[PDB]
Amino acid sequence: KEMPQPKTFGELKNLPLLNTDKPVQALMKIADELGEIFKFEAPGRVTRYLSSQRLIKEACDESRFDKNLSQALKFVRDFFGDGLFTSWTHEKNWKKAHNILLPSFSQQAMKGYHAMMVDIAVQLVQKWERLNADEHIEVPEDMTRLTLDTIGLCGFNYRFNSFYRDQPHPFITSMVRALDEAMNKLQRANPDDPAYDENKRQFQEDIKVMNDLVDKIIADRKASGEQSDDLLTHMLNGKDPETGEPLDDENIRYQIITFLIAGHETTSGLLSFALYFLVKNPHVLQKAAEEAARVLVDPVPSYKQVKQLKYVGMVLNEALRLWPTAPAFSLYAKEDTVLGGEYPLEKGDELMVLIPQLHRDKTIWGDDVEEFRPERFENPSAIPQHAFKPFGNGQRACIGQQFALHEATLVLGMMLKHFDFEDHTNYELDIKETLTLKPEGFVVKAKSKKIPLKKVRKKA
Amino acid sequence: MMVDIAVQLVQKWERLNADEHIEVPEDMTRLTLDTIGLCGFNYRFNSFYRDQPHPFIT
Amino acid sequence: ALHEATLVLGMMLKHFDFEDHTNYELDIKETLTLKPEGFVVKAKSKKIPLKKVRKKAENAHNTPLLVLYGSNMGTAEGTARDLADIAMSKGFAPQVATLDSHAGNLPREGAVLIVTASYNGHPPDNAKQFVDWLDQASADEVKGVRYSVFGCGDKNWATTYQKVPAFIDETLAAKGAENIADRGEADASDDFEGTYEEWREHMWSDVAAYFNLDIENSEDNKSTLSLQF
Amino acid sequence: VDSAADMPLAKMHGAFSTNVVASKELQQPGSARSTRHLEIELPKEASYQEGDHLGVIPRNYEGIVNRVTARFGLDASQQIRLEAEEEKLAHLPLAKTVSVEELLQYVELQDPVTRTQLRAMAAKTVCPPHKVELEALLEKQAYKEQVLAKRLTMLELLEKYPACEMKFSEFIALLPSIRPRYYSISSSPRVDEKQASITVSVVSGEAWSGYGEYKGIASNYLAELQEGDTITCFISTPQSEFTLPKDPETPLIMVGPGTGVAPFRGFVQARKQLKEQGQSLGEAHLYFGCRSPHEDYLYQEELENAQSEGIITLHTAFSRMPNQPKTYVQHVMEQDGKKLIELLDQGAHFYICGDGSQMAPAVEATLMKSYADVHQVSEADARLWLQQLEEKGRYAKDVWAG
Amino acid sequence: RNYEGIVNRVTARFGLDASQQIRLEAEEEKLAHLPLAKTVSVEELLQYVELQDPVTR
Ligand SMILES: Cc1cc2nc3c(=O)[nH]c(=O)nc-3n(C[C@H](O)[C@H](O)[C@H](O)COP(=O)(O)OP(=O)(O)OC[C@H]3O[C@@H](n4cnc5c(N)ncnc54)[C@H](O)[C@@H]3O)c2cc1C
Ligand code: HEM
Ligand SMILES: Cc1cc2nc3c(=O)[nH]c(=O)nc-3n(C[C@H](O)[C@H](O)[C@H](O)COP(=O)(O)O)c2cc1C
């Protein structure tokens, strides 16, 4: 078969389709129109967008395809370097860092992050307890305060103190600007037009703000009487069992920036989407709130208690099904090969996995794919292989999956124990793209359950 | 309610990183304005959630 | 004012040590009222005390503990590497590798911990060569090999629950076993860290007494008890 | 008001506290053995189904508590307070003052001695030959043969070694947390939703360790309770379903000698109510076995009445009747092979309850052999048949080693 | 400590067993210096109080 292709613009081919503030949502609409596979061409460049579990299960065969750096990821390597996220699988620094840092996400490590996660989660619950009547909550803004602080503290013993700030932290402002620019670059026909001279200048200055903060974390630790037995301890001290070598200084700096960003942005997104879907599905909200009350009997949650929050877990996975917050990953053909018995590929050919469309495959999920139904995840075993991939694939899957989920589950559990929520504006979903996805402008009001406090006495 | 605000001030300071410092009268104003706001009027200025002084203080 | 000030200053003084790090020169700002301007300090928390997880661990130094895994999604692989990390703390000389990479090369000395999952009744991609070698091939007997098996499974998989760890465990024994420690199981659908914890503590001791146990990791549990009043 | 030591173990099992409404002996006057029947009240929040288990948190009996306080020279009532800093499956009230006797209700006093326990004792022993002996017990072979095979306890070794300088607070802390014991509910909720019965064989004999007389902890606790006493328990539902078919005309075969009859008494009570509600009942064969009708034929009157009202057909086997061959249920089953196998061919459910170490396997072997003989197939085909029967949900076990 | 005779007169009047564990609570102060929010037998509660002071208004 010859594969479908969306509308073209003469010599620019499909490039102008990416001249939009919401390019993943545009791609999704193209998929709905064209089906499980389409070609996307730009001047000098081709990739193939996959949307069906039928093809994606083959794309996920690591003997035939390896992780590719998409254009997006190539632009982000400018600051992520050969950190774990933007390193090729065959670069020496990939397997070395993988081996050195995987022990930071072991069960024992996770147990040891719990207390610090609780620290930040208590800061978020307190901010909301302390709002006055009729004040509201900027949801993704507060979720970013919480997630950035949580990776800062758990990973690096560093306090961004985002809940002590009225604007976003400077690191977040430059992160968002840098991601925005990488995203806008995707559509540029002539990236060296001098019209983009200012764009590049702002880009370097944002890269600088982010690296200045990295330098501070490193300086604190050198001061840190440090056991701080955490991710940074492993970066500076662990040896790869294979080579016998530790990470060098340059790579460690890329790891820190990588983990500060990957370690919070997509978790912020998930919590924001999860709260969004709960307020729009009051019966689901009540069922989740019931579990929180039932399970979280103590003044702060325990590790074992968070693991007890099954339905909350289901809520989060269902939010990731509809709106996976890192919505695409890319693969390349290790050798000539045929996809689906119908689409020949040559060695090196690129594929994009369009995760939100995979997550809407009616052959897997049934006809009601737009509904928010956490019950889909009541037995996760039931889900076929490669049908649900919000954390990517194989040895290049998300290293921080358990950390994100533990954090999200803890936080959402606390929110649901401690407050009633109101969608007071009847908020219309508006999805902001910064390569990653997040609701923009989402606001709610939260009425404290005083876990009960209103007291008597008499003014009699 | 005084304890509520005082715990907010102790927490801000517990949560600073190594070698960060404290602007004393600025933080004392966050605490005192919030304390009269809350104790007197059940109103939360939320000054510890702000990086600049509250507009009312300015 | 006095109650508030007294409460606040009392808390500050309980909770921190203060440093006048700039050697601040008093500068009094007037707004009809008076206040120091530019006054800054640093506050070092007294953790009202907290510092407190670091092991006098020196690791992996020194009977030979080889840990092999069968893993597709890393649960079994992290468990394996965790074990090798606690072995290092208990003076062993641990080695971590996939299962089907020591297919035939089982250690004829020390012990071999085998941590593996199951996939619909089948071995993970990095364990298939091992099991096949184990199933048909039996000629190259497994005598001398003192092992133990830890199972990663999910009760959500009915009829296949822990089939691969079980296969390996009992097959290894119908070929000349030095099973030093009874197999252990983890149900992802319930309390995987409980069982993993049970099997582990029992495990170290089984191998301890058997020989081991002495290259770090106080023979002393150095665990206290209470017995107060 | 009124509250009892909340036990962690009671919280872990959702055990609630409640009253004993009846407690009586089931064996005949002059039986050398005892089997108890207890009726228990359930609170509003609890409920149960046929084939559910009662989880019982037991107490250690006086004899064994006194052996400990005697060994340590302590008074039962002596209040004391523990502490460690280290975790504790032993689920002890730490940093609280609590008497010795109540501390002793949190722990297992007759589990085999563990290797940690032996080392702790060796280290406090100032009797050199006595230290050599305790250490001898650590070796792989001795430990299997002298400790595990005979169920030799730390307590029995402390009594044997009065100059082992271990102290009470180290003893208590080295012991395992007290475990619940499960009993197969012997009544149907269709008769009274808020009342449940259990049927408890009383463990008693000469200790295999050689140290006097052995009593099983929960079973003797249960045996000594009386109307109005309280008891801490919870309802437990087994992973393996053990319930009557959905359709009351589906035929049943039940094998349940001794206390194994327990869950079938619930089945019988259920069928009896369904009849009284106009439902028709099919065939139901109960194979019951015991020493003698002069001794341990539990619920004889009820089971004979049931049979008279067409609720069951009753087949007995007696091991010790003078002038009769020693008979077990599997011998009777084998005589009835043809009929039992035709029934299973028509969709019968088969159930076994009771002793899982000897009785169940022999019953299973007899069923398979009846199949093989009736259908003229191999033992392998008969084994596959049974495997398929179990996978259809028609061959269920409620058996125990206890 | 209060002697047995007088403790038994109280448990008899209330139909209580000496050993019956129970737990009190008020919210209000208490010169009566009682272990509140703890479980404690009747007989030991009765060692915290005066049983033969004249009856107060
Ligand atoms: C699913 C299930 C359902 C059950 N249903 C019933 C039931 O309905 N009715 C019933 O009566 N039991 C039932 N049991 C068994 C029951 O739970 C208890 O195990 C039994 O009552 C014994 O516990 P115990 O505390 O009295 O004795 P324990 O103190 O636990 O001692 C038990 C151990 O002592 C051993 N022992 C026996 N004799 C001696 C001896 N002379 N010297 C040394 N050791 C000895 C036994 O072999 C066993 O290992 C059931 C068990 C299970 C798992
Ligand atoms: C819901 C939250 C998360 C989502 C949806 C997400 C998603 C992903 C995806 C899709 C990939 C694969 C990318 C590719 O194939 O190009 C990935 C990789 C990665 N993730 Fe996550 N992630 C989340 C949370 C986190 C957290 C909390 C951390 C850090 C603690 C993190 C760290 C990383 C790292 C370092 C990689 C690269 C791993 C490697 O290739 O070795 N992620 N993530
Ligand atoms: C597709 C699939 C099939 C599985 N099959 C079984 C099985 O047959 N037996 C079992 O005990 N668990 C089964 N599991 C549960 C996994 O073994 C459990 O998640 C294991 O912890 C995963 O380990 P790993 O990440 O190292 O690969 C299965 C899981 C998946 C995703």
Ligand SMILES: COc1ccc2nc(SCc3ncc(C)c(OC)c3C)[nH]c2c1
């Ligand atoms: C057209 O090309 C695109 C467009 C959007 C895209 N979004 C992505 S998702 C890429 C991504 N994934 C995971 C993490 C953890 C991450 O860290 C911030 C990023 C940037 N890739 C894209 C490629």
Ligand SMILES: COc1ccc2nc(SCc3ncc(C)c(OC)c3C)[nH]c2c1
């Ligand atoms: C030369 O005239 C002056 C100068 C300074 C002054 N400072 C003051 S003190 C005046 C004052 N006192 C108490 C309170 C509670 C207060 O509230 C803000 C104010 C403004 N009077 C002055 C008069």
